[PDB]
Enzyme design. Sequence first.
Site, PDB file in Angstrom:
ATOM      1  N   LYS A  65      -3.226  -4.251   8.441  1.00 36.91           N
ATOM      2  CA  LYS A  65      -1.659  -3.769   8.280  1.00 36.91           C
ATOM      3  C   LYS A  65      -0.914  -3.300   9.456  1.00 36.91           C
ATOM      4  O   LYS A  65      -1.585  -2.369  10.219  1.00 36.91           O
ATOM      5  CB  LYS A  65      -1.724  -2.851   7.256  1.00 36.91           C
ATOM      6  CG  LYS A  65      -0.092  -2.213   6.852  1.00 36.91           C
ATOM      7  CD  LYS A  65       0.669  -3.253   6.049  1.00 36.91           C
ATOM      8  CE  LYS A  65       1.789  -2.512   5.333  1.00 36.91           C
ATOM      9  NZ  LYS A  65       1.782  -1.792   4.325  1.00 36.91           N
ATOM     10  N   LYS A  71      -4.209   2.741  -2.778  1.00 35.87           N
ATOM     11  CA  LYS A  71      -3.485   3.791  -1.688  1.00 35.87           C
ATOM     12  C   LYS A  71      -4.449   3.742  -0.543  1.00 35.87           C
ATOM     13  O   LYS A  71      -5.472   4.011  -0.496  1.00 35.87           O
ATOM     14  CB  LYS A  71      -3.358   5.010  -2.280  1.00 35.87           C
ATOM     15  CG  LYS A  71      -2.826   6.077  -1.272  1.00 35.87           C
ATOM     16  CD  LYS A  71      -1.449   5.940  -0.782  1.00 35.87           C
ATOM     17  CE  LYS A  71      -1.237   6.941   0.518  1.00 35.87           C
ATOM     18  NZ  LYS A  71       0.118   6.981   1.321  1.00 35.87           N
ATOM     19  N   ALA A  73       0.943  -1.342  -0.047  1.00 37.51           N
ATOM     20  CA  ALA A  73       0.130  -0.137  -0.098  1.00 37.51           C
ATOM     21  C   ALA A  73       1.023   1.380  -0.075  1.00 37.51           C
ATOM     22  O   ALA A  73       1.695   1.336   0.761  1.00 37.51           O
ATOM     23  CB  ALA A  73      -1.037   0.077   1.172  1.00 37.51           C
ATOM     24  N   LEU A 120      -0.085  10.850   4.130  1.00 33.01           N
ATOM     25  CA  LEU A 120      -1.404  10.086   3.596  1.00 33.01           C
ATOM     26  C   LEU A 120      -2.132  10.861   2.323  1.00 33.01           C
ATOM     27  O   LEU A 120      -3.354  11.173   2.490  1.00 33.01           O
ATOM     28  CB  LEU A 120      -2.275   9.727   4.809  1.00 33.01           C
ATOM     29  CG  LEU A 120      -3.357   8.854   4.645  1.00 33.01           C
ATOM     30  CD1 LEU A 120      -3.119   7.434   3.991  1.00 33.01           C
ATOM     31  CD2 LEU A 120      -4.055   8.561   6.267  1.00 33.01           C
ATOM     32  N   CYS A 123      -0.762   3.904  12.094  1.00 35.83           N
ATOM     33  CA  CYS A 123      -1.466   5.013  11.652  1.00 35.83           C
ATOM     34  C   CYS A 123      -1.819   5.965  12.854  1.00 35.83           C
ATOM     35  O   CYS A 123      -2.122   5.629  13.809  1.00 35.83           O
ATOM     36  CB  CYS A 123      -3.125   4.603  11.164  1.00 35.83           C
ATOM     37  SG  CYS A 123      -3.733   6.132  10.463  1.00 35.83           S
ATOM     38  N   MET A 141       4.837  10.886   3.905  1.00 37.01           N
ATOM     39  CA  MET A 141       4.293  11.302   2.811  1.00 37.01           C
ATOM     40  C   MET A 141       2.710  12.061   3.363  1.00 37.01           C
ATOM     41  O   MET A 141       2.334  13.008   2.828  1.00 37.01           O
ATOM     42  CB  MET A 141       3.310  10.092   2.208  1.00 37.01           C
ATOM     43  CG  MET A 141       4.446   9.145   1.534  1.00 37.01           C
ATOM     44  SD  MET A 141       5.676   9.932   0.331  1.00 37.01           S
ATOM     45  CE  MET A 141       4.510  10.323  -1.137  1.00 37.01           C
TER      46      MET A 141
END
Lengths: 313, 313
Positions: free
Chosen positions: B165, B44, B20, B72, B131, B70
């Site tokens: 994940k 993504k 991902a 997100l 996350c 990044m």
Amino acid sequence: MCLKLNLLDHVFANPFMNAAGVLCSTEEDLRCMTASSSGALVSKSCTSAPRDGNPEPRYMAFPLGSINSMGLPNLGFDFYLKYASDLHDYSKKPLFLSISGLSVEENVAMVRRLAPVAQEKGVLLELNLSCPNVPGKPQVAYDFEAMRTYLQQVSLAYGLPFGVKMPPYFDIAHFDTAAAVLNEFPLVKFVTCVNSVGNGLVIDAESESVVIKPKQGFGGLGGKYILPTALANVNAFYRRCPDKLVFGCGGVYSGEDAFLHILAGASMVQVGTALQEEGPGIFTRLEDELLEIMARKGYRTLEEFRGRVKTIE
Amino acid sequence: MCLKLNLLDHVFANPFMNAAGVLCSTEEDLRCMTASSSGALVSKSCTSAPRDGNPEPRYMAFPLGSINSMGLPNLGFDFYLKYASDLHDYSKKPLFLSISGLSVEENVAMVRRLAPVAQEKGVLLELNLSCPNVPGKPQVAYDFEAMRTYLQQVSLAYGLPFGVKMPPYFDIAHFDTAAAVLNEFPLVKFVTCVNSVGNGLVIDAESESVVIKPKQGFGGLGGKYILPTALANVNAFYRRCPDKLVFGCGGVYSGEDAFLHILAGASMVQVGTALQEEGPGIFTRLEDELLEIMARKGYRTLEEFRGRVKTIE
Ligand SMILES: Cc1cc2nc3c(=O)[nH]c(=O)nc-3n(C[C@H](O)[C@H](O)[C@H](O)COP(=O)(O)O)c2cc1C
Ligand SMILES: Cc1cc2nc3c(=O)[nH]c(=O)nc-3n(C[C@H](O)[C@H](O)[C@H](O)COP(=O)(O)O)c2cc1C
Ligand SMILES: O=C(O)c1[nH]c(=O)[nH]c(=O)c1CCc1cccc(Cl)c1
Ligand SMILES: O=C(O)c1[nH]c(=O)[nH]c(=O)c1CCc1cccc(Cl)c1
């Protein structure tokens, strides 16, 4: 041009030393590190009693680094204390003694006995906050309340400036919490970042086997694998602990790697895997290479660039 | 001799897919992944609303791997749901849709709307738990209570098999606790190990500067740095979650690297950094390389060796 520096009321010919556990277990080892060109040496983390450690094979190295589950083999605290009190030649370089008791009470017992030797001879304490797994609870440095207890108890018992060897962290909230714990203790004068990256697994494709025997092949990683992790921990603690020194450890194979650690904030730079693999000759190489990069840049001192890594605006 | 798998009520030509975030943000990217020789693709990680992400530079790669912050960047859930519902050609290969809401409620909102599409078209959910949640708290999967709440709420809202994940862990106690949390949720059918190794710091020696702009240069590490960490997490979850699949992610550049993941327990094998750097051609190379190792060893199928890593004595 020379790399000499002063820290912790001691003089150092250069910022290099071994990392705890490498070339530092036996009297022979400590004599070899003393005879080297390193600026300092640290002894193998010890327990009150001697330990055999884990079954072999327990260390392996590869082009990108190393894996180990040594199990804290050591000659016991009485030996290291004797080495510090009777055998070490302080005229040659400073000595750090690493302690890693399996409970707070063991650490306290060791530090109470080290204190007078520290006073008399100037040996420096590095307290290792990493230990063999106990099912049901995390390593001490990953349990913030346990960490605070250890530091409170050691500070009381020892009463003199000391340092702490830290595992890596991977989360900014964790850096904030850990640094705040450390900053509660004024006697913690240096922080060594980092210990091995925990519980990696190296597998050999031909044999289809793990490469170390303990822990079903799981062990701490050192060397090239871990340099960006190490740099991040050095810098995170350098930023958060302005009243402490940071000692860098992880992934140093070259003067350039050392330069990066110093740019991140490192005062001393410790060498583990690469020392294990190349031997104590490495120290002259690292000094030459660091001086060469300083010369090419126009830096005359370490202070000119320590902690001066640039960010992008 | 073949690379075919049949899992999660889907058939896969081979175990390889993108990780991902790589080659999966735009319709163009998903069409490219679909045209590749990979066995599957993942979209993504998305949020309910589109995001621009962090300022550039925000990804950089080097010989030993990559670093990213990044932030997100993504086209928003409605776009990835439309791709799943209306545009993907399921006759080419299976599709996973990754979601990474910034709160439990955002995740719940997305999964409620995903569910009918998953049921009708067979798109598979990957929930990103590596996350952020509340700033100053650890990421979700480093906060076990948060993780449990997310899994309870998403299991109730979605009501279909999904996967998660996971970030890497470094402490055995964490492997034990995390796996135990996962095992509370029967709908969690696959676990993908691992997301990037968090908060590393790459410094360029010549410029004396960090190499990415966000977060003062701190970002997640991928690539050759993280293979042994990845393998450890695959095997740790493989051992602890006997009723779940494990997908391996981290440090795959070659068929040999993939063979190690599979020996550790991997079903699917995801490719991040190396795909970013080499492009989708990598998938034919990885397939050829893995088939050649299998031929040499006399393995005819993946199941002959999945999870079959050997330990010592
Ligand atoms: C064989 C071996 C034994 C070690 N023993 C200890 C130890 O006794 N105490 C300690 O603080 N760290 C110990 N470590 C960790 C190292 O001090 C160092 O933190 C780690 O290897 C990362 O540095 P490197 O990348 O230079 O190897 C050991 C490392 C190795 C490879
Ligand atoms: C540029 C970039 C973007 C990524 N974005 C995400 C993401 O959106 N969701 C996610 O689960 N992982 C994301 N990751 C992590 C990767 O999926 C993968 O877990 C990590 O890169 C390790 O695999 P590798 O060693 O093959 O790079 C991203 C990684 C990169 C390099
Ligand atoms: O002796 C060790 O295995 C060792 N190896 C390291 O890389 N770092 C250390 O701090 C130690 C000693 C303490 C310790 C930490 C964790 C696991 C074990 Cl088996 C031993
Ligand atoms: O988009 C990202 O930075 C990212 N990069 C990764 O290596 N892994 C991820 O899972 C993600 C997405 C999660 C994430 C991580 C860091 C910040 C924010 Cl806002 C969101």
